[PDB]
Amino acid sequence: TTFLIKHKASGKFLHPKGGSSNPANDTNLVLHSDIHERMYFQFDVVDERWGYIKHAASGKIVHPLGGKADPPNETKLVLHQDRHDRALFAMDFFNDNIIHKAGKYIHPKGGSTNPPNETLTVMHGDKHKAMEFIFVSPKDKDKRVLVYV
Amino acid sequence: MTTFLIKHKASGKFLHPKGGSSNPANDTNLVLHSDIHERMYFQFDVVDERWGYIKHAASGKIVHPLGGKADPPNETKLVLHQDRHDRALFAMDFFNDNIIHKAGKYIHPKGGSTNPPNETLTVMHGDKHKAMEFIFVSPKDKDKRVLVYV
Amino acid sequence: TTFLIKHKASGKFLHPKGGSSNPANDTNLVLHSDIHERMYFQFDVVDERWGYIKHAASGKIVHPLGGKADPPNETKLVLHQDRHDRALFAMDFFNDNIIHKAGKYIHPKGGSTNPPNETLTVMHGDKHKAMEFIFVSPKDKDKRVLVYV
Amino acid sequence: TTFLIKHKASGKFLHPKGGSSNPANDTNLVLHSDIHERMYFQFDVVDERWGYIKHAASGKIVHPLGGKADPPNETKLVLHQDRHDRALFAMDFFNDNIIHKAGKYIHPKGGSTNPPNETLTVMHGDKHKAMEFIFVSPKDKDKRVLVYV
Ligand SMILES: OC[C@H]1O[C@@H](O[C@@H]2[C@@H](CO)O[C@](O)(CO)[C@H]2O)[C@H](O)[C@@H](O)[C@H]1O
Ligand SMILES: OC[C@H]1O[C@@H](O[C@@H]2[C@@H](CO)O[C@](O)(CO)[C@H]2O)[C@H](O)[C@@H](O)[C@H]1O
Ligand SMILES: OC[C@H]1O[C@@H](O[C@@H]2[C@@H](CO)O[C@](O)(CO)[C@H]2O)[C@H](O)[C@@H](O)[C@H]1O
Ligand SMILES: OC[C@H]1O[C@@H](O[C@@H]2[C@@H](CO)O[C@](O)(CO)[C@H]2O)[C@H](O)[C@@H](O)[C@H]1O
Ligand SMILES: OC[C@H]1O[C@@H](O[C@@H]2[C@@H](CO)O[C@](O)(CO)[C@H]2O)[C@H](O)[C@@H](O)[C@H]1O
Ligand SMILES: OC[C@H]1O[C@@H](O[C@@H]2[C@@H](CO)O[C@](O)(CO)[C@H]2O)[C@H](O)[C@@H](O)[C@H]1O
Ligand SMILES: OC[C@H]1O[C@@H](O[C@@H]2[C@@H](CO)O[C@](O)(CO)[C@H]2O)[C@H](O)[C@@H](O)[C@H]1O
Ligand SMILES: OC[C@H]1O[C@@H](O[C@@H]2[C@@H](CO)O[C@](O)(CO)[C@H]2O)[C@H](O)[C@@H](O)[C@H]1O
Ligand SMILES: OC[C@H]1O[C@@H](O[C@@H]2[C@@H](CO)O[C@](O)(CO)[C@H]2O)[C@H](O)[C@@H](O)[C@H]1O
Ligand SMILES: OC[C@H]1O[C@@H](O[C@@H]2[C@@H](CO)O[C@](O)(CO)[C@H]2O)[C@H](O)[C@@H](O)[C@H]1O
Ligand SMILES: OC[C@H]1O[C@@H](O[C@@H]2[C@@H](CO)O[C@](O)(CO)[C@H]2O)[C@H](O)[C@@H](O)[C@H]1O
Ligand SMILES: OC[C@H]1O[C@@H](O[C@@H]2[C@@H](CO)O[C@](O)(CO)[C@H]2O)[C@H](O)[C@@H](O)[C@H]1O
Ligand SMILES: OC[C@H]1O[C@@H](O[C@@H]2[C@@H](CO)O[C@](O)(CO)[C@H]2O)[C@H](O)[C@@H](O)[C@H]1O
Ligand SMILES: OC[C@H]1O[C@@H](O[C@@H]2[C@@H](CO)O[C@](O)(CO)[C@H]2O)[C@H](O)[C@@H](O)[C@H]1O
Ligand SMILES: OC[C@H]1O[C@@H](O[C@@H]2[C@@H](CO)O[C@](O)(CO)[C@H]2O)[C@H](O)[C@@H](O)[C@H]1O
Ligand SMILES: OC[C@H]1O[C@@H](O[C@@H]2[C@@H](CO)O[C@](O)(CO)[C@H]2O)[C@H](O)[C@@H](O)[C@H]1O
Ligand code: NI
């Protein structure tokens, strides 16, 4: 059920800022190269492709900060306990991205294919190699795993 | 695994075994037909992340390019066959709305029409366009997309 | 200045139906494998990429039948003497297609990559291998030529 | 025949570094917001879509530094007097980019959609909004002009 969200170009992973097992609400999601249980994710299916990206350790899920239905470019991604249909994402493992219900994608802030550790993540409509993500085994960061099962 | 219909997106016709038998013979052609019934239900058996077997639910037989070659050429017919091996691996791309073979070609209606008539055969072809799009829907509601990977 | 409009997948060319030096107004544009002076074309630049696709022998130009600004899918292509901005096209020699001012493309009617002789042409929004065209020398149908100079 | 090479996302233009009427061989090509006669370009057609990107004031043309047929990502763009088929580019005014004979594109170094003045340019194969260019009138930087005539 658990997987790592790996920035495709850099090999860094999605983390709660601070890497806590229980991040506070509205904790920013960053990219970091470390692997540990506090950066594992799960995907709770809600409606076919749509569901919640769940931080495994805490159970909080990925939100655009503020929870708007149509967040603008550069809206920061955070973890928050609330469940609602503005926190709906799809894990596009064919095109290798993470898309929000309103159509923008998870990006590293600043759009780099080699973002340093602690780089924030934001929503943005653009499509390029720096917004690509693959979903891999916690025991083997190079083995893709099916997030939907 | 979830049961679903394979619906040609532009026309609304569905993937069927030729003749619509509950136990198609090996190498029975896969065709498009407008009817819905239990003998055109499919399932998807995951083998390796995105890759798996497109399984005819009534018979247990799975989708093959005729002849089972690793890299089948354009116009290779799709058929049902009991054998399981890695040349019968497909992925159900429900984001781009197609069915892609392990070697990179897609399931097409033979002739590539967006309105193929009943009994039109299906073939492998590398082209991507409107006429090779498929969506995966509920046997109870042909307009409701369902998740085939669980 | 003169070039052939070659259906990229089949090698057939754009012709006035009947192959006449002076096609009547609203004569259909068809695909035919023959080469001769009555299927030569020119391009009259009007505004950067936009211009008139001119039948060389007659001076008539390519119109969507009826001259509408936003012709629907399957609108037939014809030759007509009139000049106006609803007959504006662009010769996209990078993506290999012919695009109308309102954004649809010249297609073989029926969308075949191997259309028979006398197949009509129509406007259609779809993009695929059967709507591709390249622009070649009247003396060598495999030598691309610049239509904008 | 003369035009400005405008970075589409930022509005900055291609310049010879230092802005000289006679840049020395292997002078870097940079982006800068100024307009003046020493950043005007022309395009000398050689083979259909392929030609030389000519600095109007000096007559030198755009090269990948070193003039190799298949330059790698991050090869700097410069001006050089020599004319040969490794300095062949095409001005894709449909997809809005500048492509080299071997298939890579002119990029701002660093791939920003808002590169600051003096940012160098390099070859890179990636396609995204930061490598888009449009070609405009020296008298009106928003009016696209046909570079091929
Ligand atoms: O931001 C994610 C990263 O957080 C690190 O944890 C921080 C340590 C450094 O280890 O110092 C603190 O700031 C205060 O205790 C931690 O929050 C993790 O070590 C990284 O693995 C990573 O998760
Ligand atoms: O950050 C994700 C969370 O955003 C909340 O929205 C904020 C509310 C608190 O409700 O106060 C604001 O800061 C100003 O209106 C909101 O942006 C949502 O209520 C949460 O459900 C969650 O999406
Ligand atoms: O293949 C079409 C698919 O469109 C999805 O919805 C799109 C959203 C994502 O929520 O972004 C857009 O592109 C712009 O609003 C939507 O069209 C559907 O959820 C899928 O079921 C599917 O129809
Ligand atoms: O934050 C995500 C976005 O980052 C952009 O990259 C910034 C460029 C704009 O190209 O200018 C900077 O601010 C400094 O170079 C970049 O950090 C991307 O262009 C967007 O596509 C998007 O990823
Ligand atoms: O090819 C798929 C279709 O097969 C039909 O079954 C054929 C009937 C028509 O009912 O006549 C035969 O050719 C001889 O019995 C059948 O094989 C199904 O009725 C359709 O639902 C469809 O499955
Ligand atoms: O059509 C799918 C099946 O094709 C078989 O391959 C055929 C063999 C039988 O082995 O006889 C031929 O017709 C001539 O070599 C093959 O095309 C596969 O063995 C099956 O596993 C299956 O893929
Ligand atoms: O896009 C990356 C993915 O590529 C898949 O392999 C592709 C095969 C499908 O097996 O079709 C090609 O396009 C033709 O070569 C392959 O690139 C992988 O199975 C995926 O894991 C993934 O890496
Ligand atoms: O069989 C699938 C393929 O069908 C092609 O369509 C045929 C065209 C060629 O375009 O000529 C015909 O034979 C008669 O018009 C078509 O049936 C598609 O071009 C291919 O993309 C593919 O779908
Ligand atoms: O439709 C374009 C084609 O028209 C042919 O001309 C017709 C001849 C056949 O030669 O018989 C007519 O229908 C009556 O005279 C002609 O209009 C051309 O020969 C072809 O080259 C082609 O242009
Ligand atoms: O077919 C191209 C031509 O279409 C004409 O439009 C037709 C008018 C004539 O004005 O009468 C109709 O048949 C019915 O309204 C029109 O479709 C244009 O006037 C021509 O300029 C030309 O575009
Ligand atoms: O890529 C931008 C270009 O768009 C052209 O306008 C497009 C028309 C053609 O007029 O077809 C559309 O796609 C329909 O919406 C237009 O966006 C401009 O003529 C070009 O100058 C250029 O801006
Ligand atoms: O007329 C141009 C259009 O032709 C379509 O092709 C027709 C298909 C629909 O797919 O059904 C037929 O009528 C018979 O097979 C085809 O002639 C294309 O799909 C369109 O893209 C367009 O080219
Ligand atoms: O690099 C392109 C820019 O060059 C500037 O010229 C430099 C001036 C600043 O005016 O100071 C120097 O570094 C030393 O003389 C110049 O090389 C141009 O003024 C800009 O218009 C621009 O071309
Ligand atoms: O920078 C563009 C120029 O590159 C030259 O190639 C360099 C020669 C100088 O002739 O010496 C080197 O530095 C060592 O091999 C070359 O990289 C070309 O000769 C010029 O034609 C021009 O392309
Ligand atoms: O439509 C295909 C075109 O290919 C061009 O050449 C391509 C070059 C750019 O020169 O980069 C590639 O993509 C890989 O090297 C080439 O295929 C031709 O110049 C065009 O005439 C045209 O054939
Ligand atoms: O030099 C042109 C290339 O710039 C890349 O951007 C660099 C990113 C990686 O995206 O890491 C940096 O070095 C610092 O953030 C960027 O300058 C682009 O990704 C390439 O597409 C290309 O444009
Ligand atoms: Ni794939």
Burial class (CB in 10 A: 0-12, 13-18, 19+), D78: buried
Q: Specify the ligand 16 atom closest to the Cα of D131.
A: 23
Residue type, A1: T
- State whether the Cα torsion A32-A35-A36-A40 is positive or negative: positive
Ligand 8 proximal residues by C-beta, below 6 Å: B 75, 108, 110-112, 123, 125, 127, 131; C 112-114, 130
Pocket lining: D69 vs ligand 14, CB cutoff 6 Å: no
Q: Which amino acid is at D89?
A: F
Q: Which two tokens stand for residue D77?
A: 């763009």
Is D100 annotated among the ligand-binding residues? Answer: no
Radius of gyration of chain A (CA): 13
DSSP for C35-81 reads --GGG-EEEEEEETTEEEEEETTT--EEEETT--SS--TTPBEEEES
User: What is Dmax (Cα atoms) for chain B?
Assistant: 36
Specify the DSSP class assigned to residue B4.
B
Instruction: Let me know: does A55 contact A72? Beta carbons within 8 Å.
Output: no
Quick check: A3 and A42 in contact, CB under 8 A?
yes
Q: Are D110 and D73 within 8 A, CB to CB?
A: no
Instruction: State both tokens at A32.
Output: 């970091």
Burial of B74 (0-12, 13-18, 19+ CB in 10 A): exposed
Query: Which candidate, C1, C6, C4, C2, places its Cα nearest to that of C133?
Result: C6
Tokens of A21: 């097992």
Does A129 sit within 8 Å of D129, measured CB to CB?
A: no
For B89, the token pair is 């691996």
CA B21 to ligand 5 center in whole angstroms: 8
Tokens 């509601």 identify what position? Answer: B141
Q: Annotation-wise, does B20 bind a ligand?
A: no
Which of C12, C22, C85, C77 minimizes the C-alpha distance to C52?
C85
Tokens describing residue C56: 């060389």
Whose CA is closest to atom 20 on ligand 14? D67
Q: Residue C126: its chain B contacts at CB < 8 A?
A: 129-130
Integer Cα distance of B32 and C118 in angstroms: 30
Residues of chain D positioned with their CB less than 8 A from the CB of C49 = 93-94, 144, 146
3-state percent helix, strand, coil for chain C, nearest multiple of 5: 5, 45, 50
Contact yes or no for C148 and D148 at CB 8 A: yes
**Is C63 within 8 Å of C107 (Cβ atoms)?**
no
Task: Quote the CA–CA distance of C14 and C120 in Å, as a whole number.
Answer: 9
Cβ atoms of D27 and D131 within 8 Å: the answer is no
- Interchain pair A146, B46: CB under 8 A: yes
Residue C86 to residue C70: CA distance in whole angstroms: 8
Interface contact flag, D95 C93, Cβ < 8 Å: no
CA C23 to chain CA centroid, nearest Å? 15
* Residue A126: both structure tokens together: 């653009």
Going from the Cα of A43 to the center of ligand 2, the distance in angstroms, rounded, reads: 22
CA C17 to ligand 9 center in whole angstroms:
7
User: Which tokens sit at C12?
Assistant: 């057939």
Of all protein residues, whose CA lies closest to atom 11 belonging to ligand 12?
B113
Judge whether B109 and B119 are in contact, CB under 8 Å: no
Domains defined along chain D, listed by start = 4-144 (2.80.10.50)
d(CA C106, CA C104): 7
Please name the residue whose Cα sits nearest to atom 6 of ligand 1: A18
B101 lines ligand 7 (CB under 6 A): no
- Give the binding-site residues of ligand 16, using a 6 Å CB cut-off: A 112-114, 130; D 74, 107, 109-111, 122, 124, 126, 128, 130-131
Q: Which atom of ligand 3 approaches the CA of A88 most closely?
A: 10
What sections of chain B are H helices per DSSP?
none
Alpha carbons A96 and A128: distance in angstroms, whole number: 10
Query: Which residues make beta-bridge pairs with B80?
Result: B28, B63
B74 vs B54: CA distance, rounded Å: 20
Give the residue numbers in A contacting B (CB under 8 Å), as ranges.
Answer: 45, 48-49, 90, 92-95, 144-146, 148-149
Q: Which run of H or of E encompasses C137? A: strand C133-137
Helix (H, G, I), strand (E, B) or coil at D131: helix
Gap from D48 CA to chain C (nearest CA, Å) = 5
Identify from C6, C93, C99, C127 which residue to disrupt to test chain D contact, counting D C-beta atoms within 10 A and taking the largest count.
C93
Contact B16, B121 (CB under 8 A): no
Long-range contacts of D63-68 (CB under 8 A, 24+ apart): D63/D87, D64/D100, D64/D123, D65/D26
CA C33 to ligand 9 center in whole angstroms: 11
Place of tokens 């994608």: A105
Q: How far apart are alpha carbons A20 and A25 in whole angstroms?
A: 12
H helical segments located in D21-131: none
Q: How far is CA A27 from CA A17, A46, A118, in A?
A: 6, 23, 12
Nearest CA in chain A to B138: A48
* Contact yes or no for D61/D23 (Cβ under 8 A): no
